[PDB]
Design a protein around this nucleic acid. Structure first.
Ligand SMILES: [Mg+2]
Ligand SMILES: [Mg+2]
Ligand SMILES: [Mg+2]
Ligand SMILES: [Mg+2]
Ligand SMILES: [Mg+2]
Ligand SMILES: [Mg+2]
Ligand SMILES: [Mg+2]
Ligand SMILES: [Mg+2]
Ligand SMILES: [Mg+2]
Ligand SMILES: [Mg+2]
Ligand SMILES: [Mg+2]
Ligand SMILES: [Mg+2]
Ligand SMILES: [Mg+2]
Ligand SMILES: [Mg+2]
Ligand SMILES: [Mg+2]
Ligand SMILES: [Mg+2]
Ligand SMILES: [Mg+2]
Ligand SMILES: [Mg+2]
Lengths: 258, 227, 945
RNA sequence: AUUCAUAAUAACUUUUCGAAUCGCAUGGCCUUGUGCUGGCGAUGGUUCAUUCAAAUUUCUGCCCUAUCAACUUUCGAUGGUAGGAUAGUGGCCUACCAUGGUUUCAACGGGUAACGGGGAAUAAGGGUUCGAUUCCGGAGAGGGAGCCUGAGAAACGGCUACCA
RNA sequence: GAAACUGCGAAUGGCUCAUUAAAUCAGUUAUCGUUUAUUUGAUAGUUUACAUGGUAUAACUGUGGUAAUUCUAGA
């Protein structure tokens, strides 16, 4: 190609969006934004294929141009705006606030939250560095740069960002015993507690995570997101609480509730 | 060859068909921008001065300034040049153009009246064509009317009357770069924004400095305790 | 704005501003014919709407409101029993002012009143108070929909409580006064429509009380609110009026003419009549017309005579006479009013009658109309006749208005002579009023004012003013005016040898009196001091044009050969008219003197006649160039040369750019005819801005004549005409100030443009050689630094000085000028000016001096001036021991220029990184200089101190 | 892990940027002036970070051919030093230097009706064959050569030569 | 609101497999070896002003050339 691509085939789209393979030939290409293309949910999919509020792309555009959707407290009018992990989506006219959190299956789940919970979000500290004029700043996972961070904040820590003012309220250090959320790999969407962090200089660090059921799994550090201390998450969790459950029991409880 | 003579003071212009070769030959060997005496052209042009500006040949190709030849040549023309209008940005096209040396094979030659002779041409000197449009920017209006700074351009706008059937009205241009309260408000808002930003940054820097000093003091106290 | 969205685009979705939505919004629920939920009911209106709103709105506040009240609204009796708690909750949630939930709450509040209307009365006051707070709160946060919801709810409550509210509408109005009197126009407008529905539903008896109360209130925005309220009440449909409009108009009328009601009430009635008359067609208005006319007949009385008169002016002016069916009835009313007041009101009434009345009625009544004006308006007939002329001058003439004016002149002759002078003074300029001028005057003045003219004392401007207004009347005199004028003429010249501005105007006025040789001799005796005045020129022009040539006049012209040349001075004046009269004047003197008029004079006169427009812009330029070519081609005498050159400088005073182009091209090729004259003209123009030109003109004793001529009206159309009438009235009230002021307006223009120096500078630039020869006169400006002057009163503009410096550099031999060394030293001063452009100009003039050493380094000095090459030149040119460095022998001559140049560069505001580096460089080259040369730079820095 | 981030000193620059832009609305102060101040947005702009991308790059992995055994190096082949150019590393190119680099563990050369892969068929398993062809990646627009524009092209439903 | 200037796009998409045998490509690395329109977040009191020019032109008015083209000359 002689330049950046602008089209996305449905088969090539991220699997977790759950798009019909025969509905059309192309899928919404997320525009540039806070989150990466493969780890983002465009607003069109959320409003049409998840909430079912709109029946087609044009109706989604009509909703957006009416300025009823807010992302992180800001109005967005792009159909393919890349909303992502820990993103707050507010619909005032319908009066709901949603937090984009993966389910156990590995898919963004429609999780409704209260207003007081919608007032803040969490961000994994991807980078800390001194800017121009000797002003420290922190870059989070969603591309937010916050100046004058607390000196104790380091990489791999989590910062509680208030949406209205965009300032850090609290933070969590990355240490053993902390509650973590998996954001990648086939363990995507699971929740557990840190046990040990294995370090390899010049390589990818590995973290051992133990679930509430005592099952243990190892994951690369890049896919780990600290969300609080054990038993005290700073955000409301989706149904299932990030516990992976086998297939036989899946049959079992589906029958039981049925 | 045909002569397209333009009197720019009046804005007028007209064509003269030529048959005798004496005037045509005194036109020979000249160059675009050079001046020739009208009397050599004919008695009707006695006392006139003609500046050569260009022309077209028997095949229609135009004359181009800067190329000093009596014959056509294929020149690679680009943006912002005569004889070529680029269709696409950065487009360059090589086109055959006639040289700037006057010759027998010029179908029409364009001339500009530098100076008027004793006799008046019927179609050029005796007629005038008004300017199509008047000044638009405020300073151009002031310059055209010689207004003072205190005088407002708003009252001196040229207005043209238009009749549609029995209905009639007037139309006037929109002046640009006019001093209006909106521009003042925008300037003031911009200044206030920048000042407020600077103050906010100073406050944040001061608070960070206090936090750093407190942390520094307590860690020094702990080091003292360890000793 | 003014071209509102009348033509809609093809776009399905378009942006609309809040003001746009508000302007389009209108409060009238009944016109909306859409199916309503509450129309179909099983239990109650409230329940029917309550369930529906649960389906559509999902707001948190409404959801909380629903849960609290859900159990208690299942049945109509349950609503009645629990009415108190339901209303409290509705009021509580509305107060939160949550726009997401307002719409269901406001609708339910209206439906709540629908279920239990008579019981809602105990809730009424709180409900209205809640809406007022909400609408006031709605102003803070923009939402047009919120206003639409609130006012419709208010309208709904009025509809359901129509019976009870009507009985005490004054109480309901009392609640809405803050809304009706609110600063915002739209909030008052919306409230007025809602209250209008109640008014149209009122019984006549109840209405009479309400109208009395509001008129009592009338005695901020309340006047506008009532204006909107009543006009909405009458208007029902386009070009149609509501049936009840008859009673409302009658009830509003009876109160307005009632003595107790304030005058503002009648004015309020007037503004209503303009609105409904404009809105409604002829047919809908016929029934409204008869009720007033009958009421005006029935209630006519001395006390209300003015009030009836004022409303009658309202009817005649409203849409002119088109809306009036029968003008004959009005004429009967006018006659009855006259038989049974304020003069100004009638003057306004009759004048509008003249313009607006149908032709047939006016023919029947024009004679009685004017006789009435003589009956009572004779004191102010002049103000009337002027206003009538301004409205429709042609109609007044057709109906013999001039004859009645003659009768007025012969009736009220002695008391208002000065007013007559004002009136006839004003009407001279208008050509359409030529017939008014043709009116003959009563002879008795022409004897009386003549008698004073024969024996008049003139020792002060106050005495002079007395002749002036009598002179203005005396022009129409037919009793051999010339014999009387002449003695006064020699008196005024003798008593005032040096005329002021006012005296000159009178002389023209006195000359203007003359009608078909001695008087010609008199003006020739003293005209040098009066040529500039425009009126004096016009009077002189009328005189000489009247006289017929003969050999005797040739002798008179011979005695004063310098007459023609002296008049040429006028062509430099800034006024187009004054030049034109001088041209016309000059031509006829040539006829009287018999000397052939040159064709150049005729051509220049044509140029003046051409209008100054873009369409004629080019045409003007060719004419000026053509005559200039003719002037150069044809040799002429001094008079023609003095004529044409002065006329050219007159064209420079014109404020039309095309004119300047022609003269700027013509003048350089024709100045050789008289080089001394052109320099004098150029020199004068340069000094005009410095010269202070002030028009000092007589101020008459101030007259304290002013009063409220007419009432104030809100509608723009009536107010503007009222302002026009009052302006005439004020003008006549102060005749001394009005007569004196009109003279100033028509005197002409004497103030040259401040830019005139710039035009002369362009002429000087085009001809440097003339300036070089006459450097003596222009030298002082340079040494004065182009400052008048230790405080500076005025100074030349930067552009003017720049053109000045160009001329100096263009001189062929600057070295041989009158003061070369002093000029050279001052050119040193400019060379170091902070503005580099000034420095380059000074350097060019310095290089105009021929010095071999400087020429050797001419390029390096120029490079130092250039900002781009400044840095490299310093390093190459000024480095000690450099190859291109200045030789020691030539160091003495060049160095002062180099030092002063660097001084100007050192004065740049060192403000940007490039500019700051420039200041560092200029100081860093100092060590390269020898210590004596370092010292002089420090001296240059300290010279200003 | 760094000459990292950042900061400081001294100068330098055909040297930049630091809003002469636009929509809607008319609030607040008063010394009442078209005085001062002020709201919601659009479009631009330096640098940093993020995102969409691009470029190069580390290791391993390709069918037949030894009756192809030595290849590359004069005209860069291996490497060093310095420069030029590049967005940048780098024989990518230049100048001076050394004589290096691959190879029976198959270099080099030749054939290929060779775009590669995810896949398809068959088979009990091992295997054999197919894969231009709905997705990913690369190359092309009759064949070579060279370019303007633009963030991005050696573009071809852009331009210029030559060949047919 | 035609036309034109200005800004953006046209380097995406669609088609074909000619060349290509450590080349492409698959998996897996690196940029402390570099560019990056755009999105998103930060970020600039240090720079006649009640606001500067044609150092300027299109569209447009008008005069024309060529057999011919999404050709264009003068004013
Ligand atoms: Mg690393
Ligand atoms: Mg228009
Ligand atoms: Mg190198
Ligand atoms: Mg070499
Ligand atoms: Mg194959
Ligand atoms: Mg394939
Ligand atoms: Mg290609
Ligand atoms: Mg082909
Ligand atoms: Mg190509
Ligand atoms: Mg094609
Ligand atoms: Mg293509
Ligand atoms: Mg363009
Ligand atoms: Mg092939
Ligand atoms: Mg091969
Ligand atoms: Mg490889
Ligand atoms: Mg864009
Ligand atoms: Mg930005
Ligand atoms: Mg032109």
């Amino acid at each position: 190609a002689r330049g950046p691509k602008k089209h996305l085939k449905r088969l090539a789209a991220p699997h977790h969006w759950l798009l019909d393979k025969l509905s059309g030939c192309y899928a919404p290409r997320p525009s540039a934004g806070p989150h990466k293309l493969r780890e983002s949910l465009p607003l069109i999919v959320f409003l049409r294929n998840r909430l079912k509020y709109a029946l087609n792309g044009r109706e989604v555009k009509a909703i957006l141009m009416q300025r009823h959707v807010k992302v992180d407290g800001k109005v967005r009018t792009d159909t393919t705006y890349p909303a992502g992990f820990m993103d707050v989506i507010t619909l005032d006219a319908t009066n709901e606030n949603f937090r984009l959190v993966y389910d156990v299956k590995g898919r963004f789940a429609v999780h409704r939250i209260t207003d007081e919970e919608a007032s803040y979000k969490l961000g994994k500290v991807k980078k800390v560095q001194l800017g121009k004029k000797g002003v420290p700043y922190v870059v989070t996972h969603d591309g937010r740069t916050i100046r004058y961070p607390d000196p104790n904040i380091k990489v791999n820590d989590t910062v509680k960002i208030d949406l209205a003012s965009g300032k850090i309220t609290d933070f969590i250090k990355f240490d053993a015993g902390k509650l973590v959320y998996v954001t990648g790999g086939r363990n995507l969407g699971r929740i557990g507690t840190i046990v040990h962090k294995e370090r390899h200089d010049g390589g990818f660090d590995l973290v051992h995570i133990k679930d509430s059921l005592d099952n243990t799994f190892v994951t690369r550090l890049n896919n780990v997101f600290v969300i609080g201390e054990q038993g005290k998450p700073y955000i409301s969790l989706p149904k299932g609480k990030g516990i992976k459950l086998s297939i036989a029991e899946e049959r079992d409880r589906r029958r039981a509730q049925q | 060859m045909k002569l397209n003579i333009s009197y720019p003071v009046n804005g007028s212009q007209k064509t003269f068909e030529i048959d005798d070769e004496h005037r045509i030959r005194v036109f020979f060997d000249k160059r675009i921008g050079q001046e020739v005496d009208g009397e050599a052209v004919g008695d009707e042009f006695k006392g006139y001065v003609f500046k050569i500006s260009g022309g077209n040949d028997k095949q229609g190709f135009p004359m181009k300034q800067g190329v000093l030849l009596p014959t056509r040549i294929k020149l690679l023309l680009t943006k912002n040049v005569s004889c070529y209008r680029p269709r696409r940005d950065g487009e360059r096209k090589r086109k055959s153009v006639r040289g700037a040396i006057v010759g027998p094979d010029l179908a029409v030659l364009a001339l500009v009246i530098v100076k008027k002779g004793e006799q008046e041409l019927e179609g050029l000197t005796d007629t005038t064509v008004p300017k199509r449009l008047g000044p638009k920017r405020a300073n151009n209006i002031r310059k055209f009317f010689g207004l003072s700074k205190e005088d407002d351009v708003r009252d001196f706008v040229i207005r043209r009357e238009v009749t549609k059937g029995e209905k009639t009205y007037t139309k006037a241009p929109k002046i640009q770069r006019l001093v209006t309260p909106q521009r003042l408000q925008r300037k003031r808002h911009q200044r206030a924004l920048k000042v407020r930003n600077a103050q906010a940054q100073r406050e944040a820097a001061a608070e960070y400095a206090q936090l750093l000093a407190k942390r520094l003091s307590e860690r020094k106290a702990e080091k003292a305790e360890i000793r | 704005a003014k071209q509102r969205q009348t033509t809609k685009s093809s776009k399905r979705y378009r942006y609309s501003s809040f003001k746009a939505r508000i302007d389009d919004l209108k409060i009238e629920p009944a016109r909306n014919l859409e199916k309503r939920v509450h129309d179909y009911v099983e239990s109650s209106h409230f329940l029917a709407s309550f369930d529906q709103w649960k389906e559509i709105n999902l707001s948190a506040k409404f959801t909380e409101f629903a849960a609290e009240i859900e159990h208690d609204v299942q049945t109509l009796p349950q609503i009645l029993y629990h009415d108190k708690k339901i209303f409290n909750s509705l009021v509580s949630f509305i107060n939160f002012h949550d726009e997401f939930s307002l719409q269901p709450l406001l609708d339910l509040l209206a439906q709540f009143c629908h279920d239990l209307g008579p019981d809602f009365l105990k809730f009424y006051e709180e409900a209205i108070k809640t809406l007022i707070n909400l609408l006031d709160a709605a102003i803070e946060f923009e939402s047009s929909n919120v206003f639409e919801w609130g006012f419709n709810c208010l309208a709904y409550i009025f509809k359901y409580l129509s019976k009870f509210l009507v009985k005490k509408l004054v109480l309901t109005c009392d609640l809405l006064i803050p809304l009706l009197s609110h600063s915002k126009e739209y909030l008052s407008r919306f409230s007025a429509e809602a209250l209008s529905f109640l008014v149209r539903k009122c019984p006549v008896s109840n209405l009479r009380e309400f109208v009395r109360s509001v008129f009592e209130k009338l005695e901020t925005n309340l006047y506008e609110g009532l204006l909107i309220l009543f006009t909405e009440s009458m208007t029902s449909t386009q070009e149609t009026l509501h049936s009840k409009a008859k009673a409302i108009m009658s009830v509003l009328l009876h109160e307005a003419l009632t003595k107790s009601s304030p005058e503002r009430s009648v004015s309020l009635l007037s503004d209503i009549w303009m609105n409904i008359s404009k809105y409604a067609s002829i047919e809908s208005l016929l029934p409204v017309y008869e009720v007033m006319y009958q009421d005006f007949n029935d209630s006519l009385d001395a006390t209300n005579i003015d009030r009836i008169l004022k409303v009658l002016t309202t009817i005649v002016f409203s849409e002119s006479g088109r809306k009036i069916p029968d003008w004959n009835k009005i004429t009967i009313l006018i006659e009855r009013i006259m038989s049974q007041l304020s003069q100004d009101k009638v003057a306004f009434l009759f004048a509008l009658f003249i313009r607006n009345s149908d032709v047939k009625t006016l023919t029947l009544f024009h004679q009685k109309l004017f006789n009435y004006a003589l009956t009572n308006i004779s004191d102010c007939f002049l103000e009337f006749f002027q206003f009538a002329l301004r409205l429709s001058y042609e109609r007044v003439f057709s109906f013999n208005g001039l004859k009645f004016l003659q009768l007025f002149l012969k009736k009220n002759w002695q008391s208002q002579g000065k007013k007559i002078a004002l009136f006839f003074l004003e009407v001279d300029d208008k050509p359409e009023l030529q017939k008014v001028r043709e009116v003959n005057f009563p002879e008795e003045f022409i004897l009386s004012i003549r008698d004073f003219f024969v024996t008049a004392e003139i020792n002060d401007s106050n005495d002079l003013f007395e002749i002036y207004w009598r002179a203005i009347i005396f022009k129409y005199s037919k009793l051999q005016n010339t014999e009387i004028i002449i003695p006064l003429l020699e008196r005024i010249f003798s008593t005032f040898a040096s005329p002021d501005n006012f005296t000159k105007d009178m002389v023209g006025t006195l000359l203007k009196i003359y009608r078909k040789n001695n008087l010609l001799k008199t003006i020739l005796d003293n005209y040098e001091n009066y040529k500039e005045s425009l009126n004096f020129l016009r009077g002189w022009n009328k005189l000489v044009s009247n006289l017929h040539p003969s050999e005797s006049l040739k002798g008179l012209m011979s005695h004063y050969p310098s007459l023609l040349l002296s008049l040429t001075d006028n062509f430099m004046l800034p006024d187009g008219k004054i030049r034109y009269e001088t041209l016309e004047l000059m031509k006829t003197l040539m006829i009287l003197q018999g000397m052939q008029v040159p064709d150049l004079l005729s051509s220049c006169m044509v140029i003046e006649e051409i209008p100054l427009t873009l369409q004629n812009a080019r045409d003007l330029t060719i004419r000026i160039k053509n005559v200039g070519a003719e002037f150069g081609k044809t040799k002429t005498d001094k008079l023609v040369s003095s004529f044409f050159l002065k006329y050219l400088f007159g064209l420079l005073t014109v404020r039309f750019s095309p004119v300047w182009t022609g003269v700027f091209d013509t003048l350089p090729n024709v100045y050789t005819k008289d080089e001394a004259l052109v320099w004098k003209l150029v020199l004068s123009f340069i000094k005009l801005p410095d010269e202070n030109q002030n028009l000092d003109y007589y101020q008459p004793l101030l007259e304290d004549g002013a009063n409220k001529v007419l009432w104030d009206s809100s509608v723009v159309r009536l107010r503007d005409t009222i302002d026009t009438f009052s302006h005439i009235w004020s003008k006549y009230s102060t005749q001394n100030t009005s007569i004196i002021s009109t003279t100033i307006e028509r005197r002409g223009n004497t103030t040259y443009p401040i830019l005139i120096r710039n035009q002369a500078l362009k002429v000087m630039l085009s001809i440097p050689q003339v300036a070089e020869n006459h450097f003596v006169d222009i030298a002082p400006f340079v040494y004065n630094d182009f400052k008048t002057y230790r405080v500076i009163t005025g100074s030349w503009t930067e552009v003017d000085r720049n053109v000045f410096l160009k001329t100096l550099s263009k001189f062929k031999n600057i070295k041989n000028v009158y003061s070369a060394t002093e000029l050279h030293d001052h050119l040193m001063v400019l060379l170091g000016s902070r503005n580099t452009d000034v420095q380059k100009l000074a350097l060019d003039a310095l290089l105009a001096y021929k010095n071999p050493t400087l020429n050797k380094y001419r390029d390096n000095l120029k490079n130092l001036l250039d900002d781009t090459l400044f840095k490299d030149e310093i390093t190459t040119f000024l480095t000690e021991n450099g190859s291109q460095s200045i030789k020691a022998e030539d160091e003495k001559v060049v160095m002062p220029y180099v030092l002063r140049i660097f001084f100007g560069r050192a004065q740049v505001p060192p403000t940007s990184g490039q500019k700051r580096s420039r200041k560092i460089a200029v100081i860093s080259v100092l060590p390269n200089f020898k210590k004596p040369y370092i010292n002089d730079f420090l001296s240059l820095a300290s010279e200003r101190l």
